[PDB]
Amino acid sequence: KIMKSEVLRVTHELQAMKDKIKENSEKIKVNKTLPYLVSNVIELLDVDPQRKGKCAVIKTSTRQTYFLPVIGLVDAEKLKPGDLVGVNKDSYLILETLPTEYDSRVKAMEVDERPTEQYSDIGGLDKQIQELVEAIVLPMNHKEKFENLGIQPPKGVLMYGPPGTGKTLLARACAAQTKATFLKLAGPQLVQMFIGDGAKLVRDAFALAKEKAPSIIFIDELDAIGTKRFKAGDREVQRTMLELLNQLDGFQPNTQVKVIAATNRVDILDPALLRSGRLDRKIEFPMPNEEARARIMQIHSRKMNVSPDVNYEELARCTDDFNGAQCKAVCVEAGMIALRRGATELTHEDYMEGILEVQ
Amino acid sequence: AVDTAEQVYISSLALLKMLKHGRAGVPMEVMGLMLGEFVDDYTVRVIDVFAMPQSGTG
Amino acid sequence: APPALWDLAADKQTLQSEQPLQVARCTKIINADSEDPKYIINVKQFAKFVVDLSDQVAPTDIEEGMRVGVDRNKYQIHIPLPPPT
């Protein structure tokens, strides 16, 4: 072991390095304390002919352009043309780069942490919603098994069906089970007065989904803008829409946060919406029958003082060709006039009274 | 309550150290310390002059 | 001049009181807050600034897009202020 006795000197040199890094590593806090302004960064690779070529183009907020090479600490997500970077007083170095995404009108579209309703509020849809509950639970907790089996979850799910079916509140009810950040988005929000806004809205959605933590982005009324016209505004929605499809077709690192979509009608079905990353999950959600409407109305009305003498035959007969949110409006209306009816217990005539009241 | 007529003696040591320190006189605020000996009331002589490491506070 | 007489005699302490309250960075308004130490602020000159919060202002008193007093030397927020028709 006489040859291995020189390792002690090496360990003393290494622990001496750990003892001497406290000062030069300690000045990091006083030199990198606070970047006082914000400057935009534009990446431009240079060539010196070590003597290697590496530079970048800087733009300050006060419209002043300067010169500086790519410097700072170890960069992994950096080197992108972004803003909100660290800079000292006048030397103009890059110390702390953080993405900005400002235009809060699109950033703070729907800031929802988590909803209140859950998946246990409906009745008679487990045979078709269980695939979605799996498709949102197993891709969140079973990422470890995705390498043993080589499975990549789909990013486009088509939640299509007739309107008024409560698909929005049901997908949100599953978003409560996702436990991630819920972010709504409306179809008619892409159509703006100025040009090129849809690119900023789409790249903003993938800026918060790509940049931010694992979240949930549910959109609705996509059929209202998914028109395949052959000037025209829906062709501009073909520029923004086909741009989004290009970001769901040309991006292999799109294994991040999913994009859930729902269409209230399948009359104008875009044929280009068929792909593993695109809207491949096509589970048909028809109009619930009087049995299913009595189920979702019973579980949605399990909190009010409902009379126990309900055979569901009269309401099952009156509810003809109705939808989910319509029976939800009947439940809410019954909870509205049942107060002024004097009797605190919900009666049986209030069902047809609400049906003929709002419809 | 008394005052005299003082005059600061400047040799080439402090001068050249303020010239190298002026070459290192970046826009960032810098610090330095002057040394010397006090022989009487109305004279002051500087001999030793060094620089100080910069800081974000200045 | 009669109104400026008593205030002119009361202008002596304004020299010893001129050193404080001197801070004025054009009352720049903030935009948002990613984390509690660093606050993203935007001045009226279209220059986005970032500074840490001072010890004289509590973090719970900060509102989104609130005009408050801020230093032009230490860049910190000394004191806020309450203020269309």
From Swiss-Prot, chain A:
Associated disorder is: Deafness, cataract, impaired intellectual development, and polyneuropathy: An autosomal recessive disease characterized by early onset of deafness, cataract, severe developmental delay, and severely impaired intellectual development. Patients later develop polyneuropathy of the lower extremities, associated with depigmentation of the hair in that area.
Tell me which family the UniProt entry assigns to this protein: Belongs to the AAA ATPase family.
Q: What is its main location?
A: cytoplasm
UniProt keywords (A-Z) are:
Acetylation, ATP-binding, Cataract, Cytoplasm, Deafness, Host-virus interaction, Intellectual disability, Neuropathy, Nucleotide-binding, Nucleus, Phosphoprotein, Proteasome, Ubl conjugation
Q: Where in the cell is it found?
A: Cytoplasm; Nucleus
Binding residues annotated for ATP, in chain numbering: 161-168
PANTHER family assigned: 26S PROTEASOME REGULATORY SUBUNIT
One GO BP annotation is: blastocyst development
Q: Which domain of life is it from?
A: Eukaryota
SMART domains reported for this sequence: AAA (SM00382)
Q: Which organism is it from?
A: Homo sapiens (Human)
**What InterPro entries does UniProt report for this protein, alphabetically?**
26S_Proteasome_ATPase, AAA+_ATPase, AAA_lid_3, ATPase_AAA_core, ATPase_AAA_CS, NA-bd_OB-fold, P-loop_NTPase, Prot_ATP_ID_OB_2nd
Output this protein's name: 26S proteasome regulatory subunit 6A
Phosphoserine modification sites? 307
- Provide GO CC annotations from the record: cytosol; extracellular region; ficolin-1-rich granule lumen; membrane; nucleoplasm; nucleus; P-body; proteasome accessory complex
From Swiss-Prot, chain B:
Q: In which tissues is it expressed?
A: Widely expressed. Highest levels in heart and skeletal muscle.
Q: How does it assemble?
A: Component of the 19S proteasome regulatory particle complex. The 26S proteasome consists of a 20S core particle (CP) and two 19S regulatory subunits (RP). The regulatory particle is made of a lid composed of 9 subunits including PSMD4, a base containing 6 ATPases and few additional components. Within the complex, PSMD4 interacts with subunit PSMD7 through their respective MPN domain. Interacts with TXNL1.
| Family per record | Belongs to the peptidase M67A family. PSMD14 subfamily.
Functionally, this protein is described as follows:
Component of the 26S proteasome, a multiprotein complex involved in the ATP-dependent degradation of ubiquitinated proteins. This complex plays a key role in the maintenance of protein homeostasis by removing misfolded or damaged proteins, which could impair cellular functions, and by removing proteins whose functions are no longer required. Therefore, the proteasome participates in numerous cellular processes, including cell cycle progression, apoptosis, or DNA damage repair.
This chain belongs to the protein called 26S proteasome non-ATPase regulatory subunit 14
Question: What phylogenetic lineage does the species belong to?
Answer: Eukaryota, Metazoa, Chordata, Craniata, Vertebrata
Covered residues of the complete protein? Answer: 24 to 81 of 310
From Swiss-Prot, chain C:
Modifications made to the protein after synthesis: Monoubiquitinated by RNF181. Phosphorylated. Dephosphorylated by UBLCP1 which impairs PSMC2 ATPase activity and disrupts 26S proteasome assembly.
UniProt-annotated location(s): Cytoplasm
Would you say which domain of life the source belongs to? Eukaryota
What triggers production of this protein? Answer: Expression is not cell cycle-dependent and occurs throughout the cell cycle.
Which residue stretches, if any, does this entry annotate as coiled coil?
A: none
Residues the record lists as N6-acetyllysine modifications = 44
Quaternary organization: Component of the 19S proteasome regulatory particle complex. The 26S proteasome consists of a 20S core particle (CP) and two 19S regulatory subunits (RP). The regulatory particle is made of a lid composed of 9 subunits, a base containing 6 ATPases including PSMC2 and few additional components. Interacts with NDC80/HEC; this interaction is detected only during M phase. Interacts and SQSTM1. Interacts with PAAF1. Directly interacts with TRIM5.
- Entry's family note: Belongs to the AAA ATPase family.
| Its job | Component of the 26S proteasome, a multiprotein complex involved in the ATP-dependent degradation of ubiquitinated proteins. This complex plays a key role in the maintenance of protein homeostasis by removing misfolded or damaged proteins, which could impair cellular functions, and by removing proteins whose functions are no longer required. Therefore, the proteasome participates in numerous cellular processes, including cell cycle progression, apoptosis, or DNA damage repair.
What is the protein's name according to its record?
26S proteasome regulatory subunit 7
* Species: Homo sapiens (Human)
Q: Lineage from the top down?
A: Eukaryota, Metazoa, Chordata, Craniata, Vertebrata
**First-to-last residue of the parent protein present:** 73 to 160 of 433
